Amino acid sequence: VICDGCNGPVVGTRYKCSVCPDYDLCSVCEGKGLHRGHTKLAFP
Ligand SMILES: [Zn+2]
Ligand SMILES: [Zn+2]
Description:
Helix content is 11%, strand content 23%. By secondary structure, it is an alpha+beta fold.
């Protein structure tokens, strides 16, 4: 899984947007508030 924020890996917790098709964030990008205006699921 590739982070749509930074093009890096999504290892550990994956943050998947519940609105967009196929939009995933890594924990660094999530913690920096990228794509914060949509509800996401965080799963281990
Ligand atoms: Zn990232
Ligand atoms: Zn989204």
